[PDB]
Scaffold this active site. Structure first.
Site, PDB file in Angstrom:
ATOM      1  N   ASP A 121      36.826  43.969  30.045  1.00 53.26           N
ATOM      2  CA  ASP A 121      37.842  44.174  29.019  1.00 53.26           C
ATOM      3  C   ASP A 121      39.095  45.824  28.911  1.00 53.26           C
ATOM      4  OD1 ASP A 121      38.845  42.501  26.790  1.00 53.26           O
ATOM      5  OD2 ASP A 121      39.581  44.418  25.748  1.00 53.26           O
TER       6      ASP A 121
ATOM      7  N   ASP B 208      36.759  38.075  22.940  1.00 52.52           N
ATOM      8  CA  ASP B 208      38.075  36.921  23.355  1.00 52.52           C
ATOM      9  C   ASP B 208      38.236  35.345  23.158  1.00 52.52           C
ATOM     10  OD1 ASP B 208      37.632  39.776  23.973  1.00 52.52           O
ATOM     11  OD2 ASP B 208      38.586  39.219  26.215  1.00 52.52           O
TER      12      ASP B 208
ATOM     13  N   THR C  74      44.907  41.835  27.790  1.00 51.89           N
ATOM     14  CA  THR C  74      45.355  42.986  28.083  1.00 51.89           C
ATOM     15  C   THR C  74      44.840  44.105  29.598  1.00 51.89           C
ATOM     16  OG1 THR C  74      42.900  44.087  28.374  1.00 51.89           O
ATOM     17  CG2 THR C  74      43.849  43.200  25.846  1.00 51.89           C
ATOM     18  N   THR C  75      44.510  43.773  30.445  1.00 51.07           N
ATOM     19  CA  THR C  75      44.354  43.810  32.046  1.00 51.07           C
ATOM     20  C   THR C  75      45.762  43.262  32.983  1.00 51.07           C
ATOM     21  OG1 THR C  75      42.055  43.744  31.528  1.00 51.07           O
ATOM     22  CG2 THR C  75      42.852  43.594  34.231  1.00 51.07           C
TER      23      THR C  75
HETATM   24  N1  LIG Z   1      37.925  30.233  37.733  1.00 56.46           N
HETATM   25  C1  LIG Z   1      38.812  31.358  38.176  1.00 56.46           C
HETATM   26  N2  LIG Z   1      39.458  31.167  38.598  1.00 56.46           N
HETATM   27  C2  LIG Z   1      40.609  31.717  38.829  1.00 56.46           C
HETATM   28  N3  LIG Z   1      41.741  32.073  38.619  1.00 56.46           N
HETATM   29  C3  LIG Z   1      40.784  32.725  36.938  1.00 56.46           C
HETATM   30  C4  LIG Z   1      39.638  31.673  37.171  1.00 56.46           C
HETATM   31  N4  LIG Z   1      38.565  32.158  35.719  1.00 56.46           N
HETATM   32  C5  LIG Z   1      40.445  32.716  35.206  1.00 56.46           C
HETATM   33  N5  LIG Z   1      40.622  33.064  35.932  1.00 56.46           N
HETATM   34  C6  LIG Z   1      42.495  33.922  36.064  1.00 56.46           C
HETATM   35  O1  LIG Z   1      42.250  35.314  36.086  1.00 56.46           O
HETATM   36  C7  LIG Z   1      43.089  35.821  34.792  1.00 56.46           C
HETATM   37  C8  LIG Z   1      42.097  37.194  34.566  1.00 56.46           C
HETATM   38  O2  LIG Z   1      41.398  36.836  33.420  1.00 56.46           O
HETATM   39  P1  LIG Z   1      41.196  37.823  32.364  1.00 56.46           P
HETATM   40  O3  LIG Z   1      40.425  39.430  33.245  1.00 56.46           O
HETATM   41  O4  LIG Z   1      39.887  37.147  31.608  1.00 56.46           O
HETATM   42  O5  LIG Z   1      42.072  37.847  31.372  1.00 56.46           O
HETATM   43  P2  LIG Z   1      42.739  40.005  31.122  1.00 56.46           P
HETATM   44  O6  LIG Z   1      43.328  40.214  32.473  1.00 56.46           O
HETATM   45  O7  LIG Z   1      44.323  39.373  30.213  1.00 56.46           O
HETATM   46  O8  LIG Z   1      41.539  40.272  30.704  1.00 56.46           O
HETATM   47  C9  LIG Z   1      43.788  35.236  33.862  1.00 56.46           C
HETATM   48  O9  LIG Z   1      45.233  35.045  34.482  1.00 56.46           O
HETATM   49  C10 LIG Z   1      43.204  33.323  34.519  1.00 56.46           C
HETATM   50  O10 LIG Z   1      43.885  32.557  34.324  1.00 56.46           O
HETATM   51 MG   LIG Z   2      40.564  37.572  29.192  1.00 55.93          MG
END
Ligand SMILES: Nc1ncnc2c1ncn2[C@@H]1O[C@H](COP(=O)(O)OP(=O)(O)O)[C@@H](O)[C@H]1O
Ligand SMILES: [Mg+2]
Ligand SMILES: Nc1ncnc2c1ncn2[C@@H]1O[C@H](COP(=O)(O)OP(=O)(O)O)[C@@H](O)[C@H]1O
Ligand SMILES: Nc1ncnc2c1ncn2[C@@H]1O[C@H](COP(=O)(O)OP(=O)(O)O)[C@@H](O)[C@H]1O
Ligand SMILES: [Mg+2]
Ligand SMILES: [Mg+2]
Lengths: 38, 538, 317, 538, 527
Positions: free
Chosen positions: E59, E393, E92-93
């Site tokens: 996270d 989340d 956040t990331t």
């Molecule tokens: N199975 C998947 N295949 C492709 N992209 C994905 C998949 N699951 C999530 N994503 C994309 O990866 C990105 C980052 O996910 P995550 O790390 O949860 O968000 P954050 O960067 O805010 O923590 C999101 O924009 C999401 O749309």
């Molecule tokens: Mg996320």
């Protein structure tokens, strides 16, 4: 020393040779203080 | 989030104790501020009313003077831009001998006004353009401001009146006496040839009788005693030797190889008989005075006393060379009797006691010679050093007059006329250069401003009066030191004049120094060394 | 880095700048492997040490030594490292020209500098101004130093070293027995403040030995009096002694007393002579070679090519 | 010794130039934060915090200095911020420029009292000229007031959301306008609270027709939504607390312990009955509320909120039209608060927030800020304080003055034109203080990245015509414009206070020639302030 | 060395280019750390406190606050991410990545002598166009269990392992779809989250009731109750001393005994009221009676209640009052003055579970509980913390998908499309702010780039493939993390929150703009 020790490289070389030695938490809040916020 | 880190790149790769300044704010304005501090340090010594300063150097030696170059040398100036202005001032001292304080004042003023112009919105490049073009105009103008010329440097009243100005700023109270002395000395020197050498004016500082006891001596004085019994000579026939007054010895190695009692018995008698022969040949050439640059042997001294020869020993080689020039002799590297040409002559050579000091005097009676000495009396060594600096100023002025006989009005008259004319030139020049030209002009005002401030009067009243009178047409008008109130008078009719060359070089060097200081934009100081100083300067 | 070869009329004591100890003490410093790693050194081991009494007699020898103090006991190349050599005070110009020709022409050193052994000794003690009394095995020297440079005009040279010292002691002849007298010289030989109170319970005076020139304290005093009257305080108060000769009797206070006597009753004289690092000249050279003013003082290879013996002599004739 | 060892003392031109240089340094710190093209600074608090701003007072308030002149300049900025709430950079820059142009005259032999008299004359005439060139404004013209506020926020980071911030500030100030007993008042400090909840978007930030606090119901059975709440405010605790005296009880009978505890419960019941007599919907306390009191209020269908801050309670009073009470027995319908149109308690993020946000005639408000982070919202709050303080200054003195430096140039011209009749010695300082006012346009042009020389020359020339008092600079294009065409109009009060503070501080720092430092406080007995008798006073 | 250092000598200052360099370097450093967190193919970081405690996290907010960093720019970006997390729970990331990449793409042009003001103008223009394109492409969808399941999957698969994500999906969606009232904002406080540390992590379940982290302190109290009347109270049942300092005075041991019996009459009476309610509502031993007190219960009261067959838990949480009255269905009381059977709730089962040294109380088989609990089971403290973060989340994700009934395609699809739209919009921008627009577009493009980087593919090749597929077809396409090919995010069930994307755009643009306009970093509050 022979010269005044200041921001100069000579003293630094001399030093390297060996010359010219160099409310926090609820833990403390009392009964009254604990009620104060809650 | 409690520390600002050094930015990536030069800020991080820089060494520990090194400093880096960049831009108008970190570099240009800081340099101008340093030069301003310098000009302020030396401003109060400018002019006849200038006050002395008591500088104590790192060796605890005391200098009491209002000679700008001396103060600068004995100060430990550490800011590099100030170092550059001081370098310019020392070049002025070397080239001309007087005008170092003008260089400082003018450079500091130009830099202050350049800071002003940079604040109003000009670029260093445009400031430099305007300063250089205005310096060219000043050099074009100065020849026209020349009022007098020497017209004779073999006289003593004209030469005294000419040297009075240079030796007035220093030693204001007594300037007729010193100018008389320096004129006497300078005219004894200065042969029929147009070349005049300032090292031929010697100054002997003896202590205890006030400066009015100073004198000129057509000859030489050495704070030495005589090696032998003779102390006076009235028709000196000096013989000068760079070798000792002893028997010549081998350059490789010498060993007295005795193999018979007879050789042993005769060696010492042979040595003394040889010495007797050598000194008797010297005495028989007529020489009554012998001056050796090396040592004296006991036997040779014995025989010099026997044959009534005055022996003098000069440790230094420069002293020997100057004595040779004085007496018309030739330093012989052998103890051979001198030929009629290798001999020197003096109307008198005697040992005297000036004060506590014993001296050997080679005195000519003729009012000429190759070298002349000024014997300075005085109650203090520091006082006599200050008077020697005044003598150096007068002698360097005499040399400048031998080089260029032209004279401009002093007391700020030349500076005010320059300011006026360069302002009138800048008012015609369009473009961004006019601001810098007018500031270069106004910078000249710093000279009469400093003179007025030091006399003890309102510089603004003085400068307004000078501008008004120079508008009416009088270019020879400058400020009057002899006035409790702001006043002005004819510098020419008063006889207060400066040297065209002095002003020329002072303006040139000050302008170059200011322009050089301005051209700096980044400074990268290194950590200060503990190094045993520059190797070449020893 | 900068190779600091300290000849010091001792051994080669060579190394690098920054090292607190030399790495190449050749004179009086593997086998069964393969190669020429002992024979080449076996040749030098029995070669006579050129410097005698602080002066180079045989130059081919010295050059062969240096070459073997570069390729064998340092395993480096002089073509890329500046060299700091050391010379005895009042060393003839010819020797300087010879060693500068050797370094720049033979060893092709990019830059080099020749420093006086007494100046480097003073450097190792941390100071830059003072008068050094260097008395070794063959020579005695008083070197006044101001701003870190040996004033070339006030160097008084008298001769009362280890040899001359042990001489009278021998008087009180065979090599082994005069070396018994010298063993006593090597061991405790406490200097006498007053020989009267020292012989009661049983160099300073030429008559003692048999000479007729001057004492070492007179020598120091006149070397200080042939300098600036302002630096006189520093010379009088920073007298630094060096040399195993002067160390053996441990002479500090007898000197101090009679120098105070000679000097005006103003300057306070303090003599610092307790170091005995046994590499003082080397450490002074290392300090100098570490500084950047050494780069300033570099006689460069280009400078040498352009001037020759004149660059070695620094002009100013 | 005479004075303490730690007591240093400086005196003379050194002190004067040092104070002037310290002031100039304070001015150079924030010179770039002036105008619509200013840049932000990220300052680091000693609490590990961060402050990103282009607000002069924020910057100078996060800096600490040790030179007393710099302290005086920071106090200038504080004074300007407290009085008018804008101009914290203009004042500093003007004070710096005046002290610079006074350094010019103190380098010469003019006494600081002369410079001060000239400065006071120039201040009088600045005031006259500002009042002469000003224009009035109809405060009932909402568009006019919004443009006035835009002319004050166009310089700040919230310039991107300008309609929003302007409407927010205008609505807030117009609501917090309050008259009672013939005394008009605004008091943006105690009412019109700014509450910033990080997150969301700034475009959804709004000013509420009511208030908002960070509180939840005391019991989850209470209502969180009420559409016409009658509200009661209390300063007293709805608990049973000890008495002021030593009220120790003595129990001997068996029924007395139980009877005493029941007596406590009945006292709580009696308080809550005193409250329910008025039939409120909401009860808000500054002190606590007992759980039994919650039971009784809930039985009455009353939503209660406790431990609210006294300031928040006062704002709720002003908003819903209530009177705070401390004794429920003394509760009246005149004290009950009607005027609120909706009480809601909603979860913003993970926090419960109480809104009273449909009030009619609320004399207090809450500006709910939403944004990226705490720092960004702190900057938005500072900018909003600027906007609201400007709106208030306008509503008090509705005279308007042109910006972009137009006012500075107009006043400079008027003073230059009045200086001709002076003919004394204070005309030079007078005409310097007139030409020192141009550092505002100058600085503006610098922050645009344009040519100061040419633009300021064209502007100084424009302002010499008759009807040109409104011409100034466009800080986003680096050109000259009429202010009635650009729209940048400052409040006359702001400019008057700015000029007055600048001139008065120049006066304050010129009167200083000597600094004594290091002496101790001599005060330790609980910080003696005033306690002493006097001579009768009857 | 400058103006500030002349007044405060111990002052640190970074001016113009140096300040920009400092800030952009720190931003690029944070991005370099967090690049690996993005997506399900990201890597889990282990973080060890100064005490030795272990955290396994992917996270962005957790990693930020746990990294060991002391940079002011990092502080700014950490606060921006903290706001993102407090309001949306996710993003956040991506927030940090887009901030860093905006700063980098702006440095690209500022090194070329362009002024940062013009880049910020281009940023503002691009923000407007991007928000428009976002509102245009958003998919307004009736939030069915399948849609919510896909949303929660897209979040939980990024935060945890695939099997555990497939479990937490059903858990989270059912939890929210249970505590939800038609057109009434979701109070996530009504989802308790209790963690147990005994079994496997795939045992994490949803209890359609409540789990209190404490139990009865009287041993004779039942450990299992079948048909339970729950009395949720906030009334002290232990000895309370008088406010007014009363004290007892007696002249005989018998009087002392009478006073000892009397001093408890006040609490005996409330216990008697409870017991009378119990007898009146369950006259036999068929049903059960469970008292849950927010306040204390002394051993005498515990004995009195056990004797009558009541299970009493004491000192529950102030939130459990509401959670129990919404799950079970009673009324929480601060007094037993006038209590009636209508004040009681019903639980079809109540029992106790001992785990090592602690006890838990389960209240299940409620009728239609508007409050539930997620039981986080796992073998390690760090597993439990990781699952807590993941369920936070996921809960925020489903809540946001319901609140904002729209939902946005994922896998960088919206970012690719917004970049293309910004690049097609560029000519309509006047001046060199077109470069700021280009910077915004290439910054938005960091999400697909990093997704490719983490799935193990070439960023440039994948990105050209994806942009080509989106320009030729127009289908909103993103990265297929198993083939590196373009894929339709809406068709494969990769959903993101419209609210999250909008918050990203707004906050990232704002903080990047404010950073670029910084020209002096200054620490001068010393001494
Ligand atoms: N199975 C998947 N295949 C492709 N992209 C994905 C998949 N699951 C999530 N994503 C994309 O990866 C990105 C980052 O996910 P995550 O790390 O949860 O968000 P954050 O960067 O805010 O923590 C999101 O924009 C999401 O749309
Ligand atoms: Mg996320
Ligand atoms: N009697 C005098 N009246 C007015 N000015 C004088 C007089 N004598 C010398 N000066 C001026 O003093 C200045 C030189 O003084 P000095 O301190 O020696 O400076 P510098 O070292 O530059 O020559 C010149 O401007 C010269 O005109
Ligand atoms: N768009 C603009 N163009 C030119 N000048 C402006 C503009 N906006 C404001 N100004 C003027 O520039 C100055 C900006 O003030 P500001 O930077 O906010 O600092 P402060 O108002 O605190 O002195 C004010 O004098 C204002 O009148
Ligand atoms: Mg002169
Ligand atoms: Mg403002």
């Amino acid at each position: 020393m022979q010269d005044p020790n200041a921001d100069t490289e000579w003293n630094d070389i001399l030093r390297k040779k060996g010359i010219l030695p160099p409310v926090k938490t609820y833990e403390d809040m009392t009964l009254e203080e604990l009620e104060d916020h809650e | 989030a409690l520390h600002v880190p050094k930015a990536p790149g030069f800020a991080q790769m820089l060494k520990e104790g090194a400093k880096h300044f960049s831009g108008l704010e970190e570099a240009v304005y800081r340099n101008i501020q340093a030069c301003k501090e310098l000009a302020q340090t030396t401003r109060t010594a400018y002019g006849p009313n200038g006050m002395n300063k008591m500088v104590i150097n790192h060796l605890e030696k005391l200098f009491v003077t209002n000679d700008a170059a001396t103060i600068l040398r004995e100060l430990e100036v550490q800011h590099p831009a100030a170092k550059m202005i001081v370098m310019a001032s020392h070049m002025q001292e070397q080239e001309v001998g007087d005008g170092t304080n003008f260089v400082l004042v003018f450079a500091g003023a130009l830099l202050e006004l350049a800071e002003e112009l940079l604040r109003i919105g000009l670029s260093v490049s445009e400031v430099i353009e305007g300063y250089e073009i205005a310096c060219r105009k000043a050099h074009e103008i100065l020849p026209n401001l020349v009022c007098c010329s020497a017209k004779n440097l073999r006289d003593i009243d004209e030469v005294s009146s000419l040297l009075r100005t240079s030796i007035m700023s220093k030693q204001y109270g007594n300037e007729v006496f010193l100018a008389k002395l320096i004129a006497q000395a300078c005219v004894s020197i200065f042969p029929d040839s147009g070349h005049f050498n300032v090292d031929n004016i010697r100054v002997c500082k003896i202590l205890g009788s006030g400066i009015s006891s100073s004198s000129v001596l057509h000859g030489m004085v050495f704070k030495k005693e005589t090696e032998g019994d003779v102390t006076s000579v009235k028709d000196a026939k000096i013989a000068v030797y760079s070798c000792p007054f002893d028997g010549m010895i081998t350059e490789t190695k010498g060993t007295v190889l005795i193999k018979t009692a007879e050789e042993l018995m005769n060696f010492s008698k042979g040595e003394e008989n040889l010495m007797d022969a050598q000194v008797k040949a010297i005495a028989d050439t007529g020489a009554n005075v012998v001056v050796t640059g090396g040592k004296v042997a006991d036997m040779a001294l014995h025989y010099a006393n026997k044959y009534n020869i005055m022996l003098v020993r000069l440790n230094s080689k420069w002293d020997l060379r100057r004595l040779c020039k004085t007496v018309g002799a030739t330093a012989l590297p052998r103890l051979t009797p001198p030929v009629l040409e290798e001999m020197g002559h003096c109307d008198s050579v005697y040992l005297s006691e000036v004060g506590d000091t014993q001296v050997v005097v080679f005195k000519h009676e003729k009012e000429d010679g190759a070298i002349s000495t000024i014997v300075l009396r005085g109650s203090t060594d520091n006082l006599m050093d200050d008077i020697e600096r005044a003598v150096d100023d007068g002698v360097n002025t005499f040399k400048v007059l031998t080089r260029d006989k032209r004279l401009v009005p002093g007391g700020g008259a030349t500076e005010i006329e320059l300011a006026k004319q360069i302002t009138s030139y800048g008012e015609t020049c369009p473009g961004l250069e006019q601001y810098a030209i007018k500031k270069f002009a106004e910078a000249f005002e710093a000279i009469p401003r400093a003179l007025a401030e030091n006399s003890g009067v309102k510089a603004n009243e003085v400068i307004s009066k000078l501008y008004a009178v120079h508008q009416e047409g009088n270019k020879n008008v400058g400020l009057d030191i002899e006035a409790e109130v702001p006043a002005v008078k004819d510098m020419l009719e008063a006889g207060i004049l400066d040297t065209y060359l002095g002003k020329y070089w002072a303006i040139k060097l000050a302008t170059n120094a200011a322009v050089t200081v301005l051209r700096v934009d980044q400074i990268i100081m290194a950590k200060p060394a503990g190094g045993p100083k520059p190797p070449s300067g020893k | 880095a900068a190779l600091v070869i300290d000849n010091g009329s001792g051994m080669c004591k060579a190394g690098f700048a920054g090292d607190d100890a030399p790495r190449a003490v050749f004179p009086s410093i593997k086998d069964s492997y393969v190669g020429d790693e002992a024979q080449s050194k076996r040749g030098i081991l029995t070669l006579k040490y050129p410097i005698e009494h602080g002066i180079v007699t045989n130059w081919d020898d010295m050059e062969k030594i240096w070459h073997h103090t570069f390729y064998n006991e340092l395993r480096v190349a002089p073509e890329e490292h500046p060299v700091l050599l050391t010379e005895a005070p009042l060393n003839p110009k010819a020797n300087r020209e010879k060693m500068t020709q050797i370094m720049f022409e033979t060893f092709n050193t990019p830059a080099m500098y020749v420093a006086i052994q007494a100046v480097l000794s003073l450097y190792a003690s941390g100071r830059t101004t003072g008068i050094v009394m260097d008395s070794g095995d063959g020579v005695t020297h008083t070197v006044p130093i101001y701003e870190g440079y040996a004033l070339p005009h006030a160097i008084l040279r008298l001769d009362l070293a280890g040899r001359d010292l042990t001489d009278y002691l021998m008087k009180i002849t065979t090599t082994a027995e005069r070396e018994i007298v010298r063993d006593i010289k090597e061991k405790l030989c406490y200097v006498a403040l007053d020989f009267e109170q020292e012989m009661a319970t049983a160099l300073f005076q030429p008559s003692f030995l048999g000479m007729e020139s001057c004492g070492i304290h007179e020598t120091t005093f006149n070397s200080i009096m042939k300098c600036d009257v302002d630096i006189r305080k520093d010379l009088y108060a920073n007298t630094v002694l060096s040399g195993g000769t002067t160390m053996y009797p441990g002479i500090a206070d007898r000197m101090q007393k009679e120098i105070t006597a000679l000097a005006p009753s103003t300057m306070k004289i303090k003599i610092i002579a307790p170091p005995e690092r046994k590499y003082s000249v080397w450490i002074g050279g290392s300090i100098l070679a570490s500084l950047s003013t050494f780069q300033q003082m570099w006689i460069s290879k280009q400078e040498y090519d352009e001037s020759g013996p004149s660059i070695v002599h620094r002009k100013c004739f | 010794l005479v004075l303490s060892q730690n007591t240093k003392r400086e005196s003379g031109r050194k002190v004067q130039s040092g104070n002037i240089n310290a002031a100039k340094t304070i001015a150079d710190i924030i010179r770039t934060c002036l105008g619509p093209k200013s840049m932000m600074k990220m300052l680091l608090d000693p609490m590990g915090g961060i402050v990103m701003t282009n607000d002069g007072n924020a910057i100078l308030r996060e800096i600490q200095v040790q030179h007393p002149a710099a302290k005086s300049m920071i106090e200038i900025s504080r004074t300007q911020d407290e009085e008018v709430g804008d101009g914290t950079t203009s004042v500093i820059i003007l004070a710096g420029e005046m002290l610079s142009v006074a350094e010019h005259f103190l380098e010469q032999q003019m006494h600081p009292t002369v410079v001060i008299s000239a400065y006071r004359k120039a201040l009088d005439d600045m005031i006259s000229t500002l009042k002469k060139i000003s224009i009035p404004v109809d405060i009932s013209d909402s568009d006019m007031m919004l443009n006035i506020i835009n002319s004050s926020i166009t310089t700040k980071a919230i310039s991107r959301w300008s309609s929003l911030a302007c409407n927010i500030a205008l609505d807030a100030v117009k609501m917090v306008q309050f008259e009672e007993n013939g005394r008009k008042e605004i008091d943006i400090k105690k009412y019109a609270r700014v509450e910033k909840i990080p997150g969301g978007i700034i475009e959804d930030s709004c000013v509420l027709r009511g208030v908002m606090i960070n509180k939840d119901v005391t019991h989850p059975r209470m209502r969180r939504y009420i559409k016409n709440p009658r509200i009661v405010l209390l300063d007293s605790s709805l608990e049973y607390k000890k008495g002021e005296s030593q009220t120790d009880i003595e129990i001997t009978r068996e029924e007395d312990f139980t009877r005493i505890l029941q007596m406590e419960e009945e006292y709580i019941q009696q308080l809550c009955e005193d409250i329910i007599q008025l039939k409120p919907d909401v009860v808000i306390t500054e002190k606590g509320i007992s759980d039994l009191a919650q039971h009784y209020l809930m039985r009455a269908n009353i939503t209660a909120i406790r431990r609210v801050r006294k300031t928040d309670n006062n704002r709720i009073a002003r908003a819903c039209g209530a009177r705070i009470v401390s004794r429920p027995e003394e509760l009246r319908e005149d004290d009950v608060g009607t005027g609120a149109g909706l009480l809601e308690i909603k979860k913003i993020g993970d926090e419960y927030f109480t809104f009273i946000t449909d009030c009619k005639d609320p004399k207090a408000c809450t500006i709910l800020l939403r944004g990226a982070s705490k720092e960004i919202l702190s900057e938005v709050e500072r900018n909003l304080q600027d906007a609201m303080q400007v709106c208030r200054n306008v509503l008090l003195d509705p005279q308007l003055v042109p910006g972009g430096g137009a006012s500075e140039m107009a006043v400079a011209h008027a003073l230059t034109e009045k200086s001709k009749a002076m003919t004394g010695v204070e005309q030079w300082p007078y005409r310097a203080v007139a030409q020192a006012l141009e550092v505002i346009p100058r600085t503006l042009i610098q922050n645009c990245g344009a040519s100061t020389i040419r633009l300021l020359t064209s502007l100084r020339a424009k302002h010499t015509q008759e009807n040109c008092e409104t011409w100034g600079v466009n800080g986003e294009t680096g050109t000259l414009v009429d202010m009635k065409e650009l729209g940048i109009w400052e409040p006359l009060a702001v400019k008057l206070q700015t000029y007055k503070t600048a001139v008065e501080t120049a006066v304050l720092l010129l009167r200083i020639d000597d600094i004594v430092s290091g002496h101790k406080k001599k005060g330790d007995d609980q910080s003696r302030q005033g306690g002493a008798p006097d001579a009768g006073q009857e | 060395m400058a103006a500030v250092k002349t007044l405060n000598p111990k002052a640190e200052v970074a001016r113009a280019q140096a300040a920009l360099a400092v800030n952009i370097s720190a931003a690029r450093g944070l991005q370099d750390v967090l690049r690996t967190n993005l997506g399900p193919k990201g890597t889990m970081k282990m973080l060890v406190s100064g005490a030795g405690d272990i955290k396994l996290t992917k996270d962005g907010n957790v990693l930020l606050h746990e990294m060991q960093i002391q940079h002011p720019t990092a502080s700014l970006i950490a606060k921006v991410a903290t706001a993102q997390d407090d309001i949306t729970g996710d993003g956040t990331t991506s927030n940090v990545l887009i901030i860093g990449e905006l700063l980098k793409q702006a440095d690209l042009y500022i090194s070329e002598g362009l002024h940062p003001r013009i880049i910020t103008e281009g940023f503002e223009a691009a923000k407007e166009k991007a928000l428009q394109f976002l509102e245009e492409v958003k998919v307004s969808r009736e939030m069915d269990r399948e849609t919510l399941i896909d949303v929660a999957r897209t979040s939980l698969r990024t935060k945890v392992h695939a099997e555990l994500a497939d479990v937490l999906t059903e858990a989270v969606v059912d939890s929210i779809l249970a505590i939800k009232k038609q057109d009434e904002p979701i109070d996530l406080f009504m989802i308790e989250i209790m963690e147990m540390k005994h079994k496997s992590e795939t045992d994490t379940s949803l209890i359609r009731g409540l789990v209190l982290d404490h139990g009865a302190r009287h041993p004779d109290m039942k450990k299992r109750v079948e048909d339970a009347y729950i009395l949720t109270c906030n009334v002290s049942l232990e000895y309370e001393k008088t406010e007014v300092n009363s004290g007892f005075f007696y002249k005989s041991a018998e009087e002392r005994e009478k006073l000892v019996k009397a001093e408890r009459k006040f609490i005996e009476d409330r216990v008697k009221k409870i017991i009378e309610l119990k007898r009146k509502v369950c006259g036999d031993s068929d049903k059960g009676f469970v008292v849950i007190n927010q306040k204390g219960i002394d051993p005498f009261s515990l004995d009195a209640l056990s004797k009558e067959g009541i299970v009493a838990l004491r000192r529950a949480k102030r939130r459990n009052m509401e959670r129990l009255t919404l799950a079970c269905g009673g009324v929480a009381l601060n007094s037993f003055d006038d209590l009636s059977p209508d004040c009681l709730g019903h639980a079809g089962l109540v029992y106790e579970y001992t785990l090592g040294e602690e006890k838990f109380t389960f209240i299940e088989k409620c009728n239609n509980p508007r409050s539930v609990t997620l039981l986080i089971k796992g073998p390690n403290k760090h597993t439990l913390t990781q699952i807590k973060d993941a369920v936070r989340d996921g809960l925020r994700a489903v809540k946001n998908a319901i609140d904002d009934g729209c939902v946005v395609p994922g896998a960088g699809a919206v970012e690719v499309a917004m970049a293309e739209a910004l690049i097609k919009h560029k000519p309509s921008v006047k001046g060199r702010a077109q470069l700021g627009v280009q910077a915004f577009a290439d910054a938005l493009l960091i999400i697909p780039k990093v997704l490719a980087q983490n799935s193990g593919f070439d960023l440039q090749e994948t990105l050209v493939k994806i942009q080509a597929e989106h320009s030729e077809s127009g289908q909103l396409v993103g990265v297929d993390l198993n083939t590196g090919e373009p894929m339709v995010a809406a068709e494969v069930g990769v959903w993101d929150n419209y609210c999250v994307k909008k918050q990203l755009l707004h906050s990232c643009t704002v903080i990047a703009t404010n950073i670029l306009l910084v020209d002096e970093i200054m620490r001068a509050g010393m001494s």
